[PDB]
Design an enzyme around this catalytic site. Structure first.
Site, mmCIF file in Angstrom:
data_model
loop_
_atom_site.group_PDB
_atom_site.id
_atom_site.type_symbol
_atom_site.label_atom_id
_atom_site.label_comp_id
_atom_site.label_asym_id
_atom_site.label_seq_id
_atom_site.Cartn_x
_atom_site.Cartn_y
_atom_site.Cartn_z
ATOM 1 N N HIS A 183 0.823 -1.225 0.000
ATOM 2 C CA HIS A 183 0.000 0.000 0.000
ATOM 3 C C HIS A 183 0.830 1.236 0.000
ATOM 4 C CE1 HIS A 183 -3.279 -2.793 1.759
ATOM 5 N NE2 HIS A 183 -3.182 -2.897 0.440
ATOM 6 N N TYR B 282 -1.734 1.967 13.714
ATOM 7 C CA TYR B 282 -1.083 3.001 12.902
ATOM 8 C C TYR B 282 -1.526 4.385 13.329
ATOM 9 C CZ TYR B 282 -1.067 -0.696 9.192
ATOM 10 O OH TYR B 282 -0.968 -1.862 8.434
HETATM 11 C C1 LIG Z 1 -7.162 1.242 6.118
HETATM 12 C C2 LIG Z 1 -8.467 1.893 5.719
HETATM 13 C C3 LIG Z 1 -9.386 1.247 4.928
HETATM 14 N N1 LIG Z 1 -10.577 1.827 4.600
HETATM 15 C C4 LIG Z 1 -11.555 1.104 3.759
HETATM 16 C C5 LIG Z 1 -11.202 1.159 2.277
HETATM 17 C C6 LIG Z 1 -11.728 -0.195 1.806
HETATM 18 O O1 LIG Z 1 -13.091 -0.010 1.417
HETATM 19 C C7 LIG Z 1 -11.652 -1.071 3.033
HETATM 20 C C8 LIG Z 1 -10.411 -1.940 3.065
HETATM 21 O O2 LIG Z 1 -9.250 -1.192 2.720
HETATM 22 P P1 LIG Z 1 -7.858 -1.884 2.288
HETATM 23 O O3 LIG Z 1 -8.063 -2.540 0.924
HETATM 24 O O4 LIG Z 1 -6.841 -0.595 2.232
HETATM 25 O O5 LIG Z 1 -7.562 -2.953 3.388
HETATM 26 O O6 LIG Z 1 -11.590 -0.240 4.200
HETATM 27 C C9 LIG Z 1 -10.858 3.083 5.020
HETATM 28 O O7 LIG Z 1 -11.929 3.640 4.665
HETATM 29 N N2 LIG Z 1 -9.983 3.755 5.757
HETATM 30 C C10 LIG Z 1 -8.814 3.247 6.150
HETATM 31 O O8 LIG Z 1 -8.004 3.874 6.858
#
Ligand SMILES: Cc1cn([C@H]2C[C@H](O)[C@@H](COP(=O)(O)O)O2)c(=O)[nH]c1=O
Ligand SMILES: Cc1cn([C@H]2C[C@H](O)[C@@H](COP(=O)(O)O)O2)c(=O)[nH]c1=O
Lengths: 202, 202
Positions: free
Chosen positions: A63, A133
């Site tokens: 990421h 985090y």
């Molecule tokens: C890490 C994170 C994920 N998300 C959401 C985005 C995706 O819809 C889902 C999973 O994210 P990810 O693919 O980055 O693990 O959670 C947030 O809205 N805020 C955040 O800080």
């Protein structure tokens, strides 16, 4: 607290002392003096925190945030055990394309500072592994990009004897080299400029 | 994220949504947009974080920082289960002498913002209970004072069926009322001035 520079330029591993008494234990995962000593300025202002729990064999990453605006991060493992991975995806960096890894467990806790513009991945080595985090900017979906963590080119330490558990978004991610070709990777100079503003001494 | 004003002026309970998939669970305990809406400005610059783990029946508190300099805090329970308690010890506060409690568990996680000048206590309801904090100022022993959590005048919910496990410093702490007579409590006006400087938008 001890600090150790990682092989990816600007990334830092911090090892807090663990204090114990009859009630339990205490660590101070982020400490301003040790941080300033190692980094040269204080942590970014914190825009958001994350508490992620993972099953054993989950691999998350790689990421990164589109830069600008970029995101700097500070992470530690609050439960369970992870192999944390920093990947230098900043074009022009003296350590471009390199990675380093930090074993994060509960006996010898370590935290990692991730500069602006780097990539992050981890593998959960135990069930109920919590990664905690602090972020320099709130997560915005449209700015959040991924690279393939399973890229045999990279050889990340993400195989622990089970089939990896990976999200859709991570599974389909393009490789580092493909992202580079497409112009999607952060630039090192730009990343460091942003980082110096984020971590400026007030 | 939902915010709820607690009975202690300025203290706020935040409820993040729990996201789940095949990999695990995710919450975002601190979110700037929700925080700014509820508090009026962003979180303090983070000087230090804490990871505290406690046995069942541990009672920590009541703790406060001498003000000035004072400390504001943002806390959530990253593992286990706690009864988190905020106590208004700020002389001149419209809610002086009141407390409020937030049950912090893994099923419906809640975070709390603790203003400058307030007291904090908690009881661990399970073994291996982890409280995770961001602080506006690093811990300095000489500035870290205590008040009696067992004080009959307060009736805090701190006995859960095992003999409480309490540090010596907490056990011998004086009551809130005694500390007021001795001149040892934060002043509300001063606390609010500090708080405004910490959490200013500029
Ligand atoms: C890490 C994170 C994920 N998300 C959401 C985005 C995706 O819809 C889902 C999973 O994210 P990810 O693919 O980055 O693990 O959670 C947030 O809205 N805020 C955040 O800080
Ligand atoms: C909470 C905390 C405690 N301490 C120390 C002070 C005491 O010697 C010991 C226990 O403190 P406590 O009585 O406030 O829990 O740990 C720190 O040095 N930094 C901290 O952030």
């Amino acid at each position: 607290m001890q600090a150790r520079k990682l092989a990816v330029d600007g990334a830092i591993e911090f090892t807090p002392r663990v204090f114990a008494d009859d009630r339990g234990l205490l660590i101070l995962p982020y400490q301003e003096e040790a941080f300033v000593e190692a980094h040269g300025g204080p942590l970014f202002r914190v825009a958001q925190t994350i508490h992620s729990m993972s099953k054993r064999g989950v691999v998350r990453g790689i990421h990164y945030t589109v830069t600008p605006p970029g995101t700097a991060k500070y992470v530690y493992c609050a439960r369970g055990k992870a192999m944390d991975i920093v990947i230098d995806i900043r074009v022009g960096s003296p350590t471009f394309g390199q990675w380093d890894s930090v074993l994060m467990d509960q006996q010898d806790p370590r935290a990692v500072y991730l500069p602006v513009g780097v990539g992050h991945a981890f593998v959960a080595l135990e069930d109920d592994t919590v990664m905690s985090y602090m972020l320099s900017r709130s997560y915005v979906t449209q700015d959040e990009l991924a690279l393939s963590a399973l890229d045999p080119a990279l050889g990340l330490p993400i195989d622990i004897g089970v089939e990896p558990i990976v999200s859709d978004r991570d599974r389909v991610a393009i490789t580092l080299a493909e992202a580079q070709r497409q112009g999607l990777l952060p630039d090192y100079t730009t990343s460091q400029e942003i980082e110096r503003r984020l971590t400026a001494v007030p």
